[PDB]
């Protein structure tokens, strides 16, 4: 709820034709603008050329936004989501005037689903905190995904980077007799892939041993 | 050459078909046996089969092992060095009697060369190792390493260097002591597999 209201008060800049792929066989592009009665998805044409093949259309949808703005989005059909060719995108106001131009590569705009099954335990010997987790559901090329872990003290900024492929993390500099909340996020790795960090996964809290 | 006389003595182990690839576009297979007078390449049949492909015969060879046994080796032609698909190998005597049967995957029997140009400098009271990967090898960034640290004067410690990293930064090392380092490499998963290479020429440094 807090984060909800936190978003409402935020500050956005200029509108952008934003695009992303969740699994490497889809693509959703969108943008947002203010309302205007008589302005529905039919007013815009989202066309897209793709590696010398003919331009094609994408049916635009309209959805409401918590901040009172409307967003228009198109999701490309599976067959047109090749991961390494220059997809050109074009959007025009029925009045002829162009709204956006953007040439992207699907592999360059990855935004995965957050990781799952984050579980936490203490190492049998040391007693340190050992973190394990599984990669985002139904997503390919797992060994190419790097992560980042956030460690909060029930403190200060502590975020551990995790070499791509590895879904385990053992922490050792933690105070004893303390509750720590962890949460991990994912990202496609270079150089083949590029994109954005995912949302955080459901968190887990855990006490540390009395003395270490 | 003491290492040389040592290998002559060291106890045996069961006969076995062994295969390995060096530069990931080559494959050698072989076995050793009692050098009984008479035998030769002609007395044995060595053929392989890549899936969805025909059985082919391999031109066997024979050479004396340093220890006295005979090594019969076949070396697949370049074009048949396809990695990810299952390779089958049947070595049977001319009499039909079966000898060996091993199904492998080329990418899973890599015995790289040992690293080169290893160097150990000084820092923050710390020691920094740096080295090159086995010369003329592709997929460089798929090779993980391991460093051997053995303190001179009447010992040891070992570090697992992660993939594609050709530099190690050693910390905890007792003051005035003479250390002798070394490094060895092997192909790393998910794609590859294999065995540890030999060591690289070592380097000593007095702290």
């Amino acid at each position: 709820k807090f984060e909800s209201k936190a978003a409402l008060l935020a500050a956005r800049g200029p509108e952008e034709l934003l695009c992303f792929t969740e699994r490497l066989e889809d693509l959703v592009c969108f943008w947002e603008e203010a309302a205007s009665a008589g302005v529905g998805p039919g007013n815009y044409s989202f066309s897209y050329q793709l590696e010398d093949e003919p331009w094609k259309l994408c049916r635009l949808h309209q959805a409401p936004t918590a901040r009172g703005a409307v967003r228009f989005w198109c999701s490309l059909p599976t067959a047109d989501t090749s991961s390494f060719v220059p997809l050109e995108l074009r959007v025009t106001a029925a009045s002829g005037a162009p709204r956006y131009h953007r040439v992207i590569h699907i592999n360059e705009v990855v935004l995965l689903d957050a990781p799952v099954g984050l579980v936490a335990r203490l190492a049998d010997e040391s007693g340190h905190v050992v973190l394990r987790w599984l990669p985002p559901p139904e997503t390919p090329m797992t060994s190419h995904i790097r992560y980042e872990v956030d460690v909060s003290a029930g403190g200060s900024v502590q975020r551990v980077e995790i070499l791509e492929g590895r879904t385990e993390c053992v922490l050792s500099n933690l105070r004893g007799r303390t509750r720590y909340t962890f949460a991990v996020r994912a990202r496609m790795a270079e150089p083949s892939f590029g994109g954005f960090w995912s949302a955080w996964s459901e968190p887990v809290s855990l006490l540390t041993p009395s003395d270490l | 050459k003491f290492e040389s006389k040592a290998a002559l003595l060291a106890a045996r182990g069961p006969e076995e078909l062994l295969c390995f690839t060096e530069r990931l576009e080559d494959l050698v297979c072989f076995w050793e046996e009692a050098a009984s007078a008479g035998v030769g390449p002609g007395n044995y049949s060595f053929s392989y089969q890549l899936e969805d492909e025909p059985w082919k015969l391999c031109r066997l060879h024979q050479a004396p092992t340093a220890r006295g046994a005979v090594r019969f080796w076949c070396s697949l032609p370049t074009a048949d060095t396809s990695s990810f698909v299952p390779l089958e190998l049947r070595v049977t005597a001319a009499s039909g009697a079966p000898r060996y049967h091993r199904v492998i995957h080329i990418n899973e029997v890599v015995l790289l060369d040992a690293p080169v140009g290893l160097v150990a400098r000084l820092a923050s009271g710390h020691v920094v190792l740096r080295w090159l990967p086995p010369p003329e090898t592709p997929m460089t960034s798929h090779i993980r390493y391991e460093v051997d640290v053995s303190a001179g004067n009447g010992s040891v410690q070992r570090v697992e260097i992660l993939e594609g990293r050709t530099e190690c930064v050693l910390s905890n090392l007792r003051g005035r002591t003479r250390y002798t380092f070394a490094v060895r490499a092997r192909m790393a998963e998910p794609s590859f597999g294999g065995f540890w290479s030999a060591w690289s020429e070592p380097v000593s440094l007095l702290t």
Binding site: F84 | L24, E25, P138, M139, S141
Partner: peptide
Amino acid sequence: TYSCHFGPLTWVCKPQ
């Protein structure tokens, strides 16, 4: 699918 191959550092894949 793509036409990949080996190389110095890692996989090289041109659009097949």
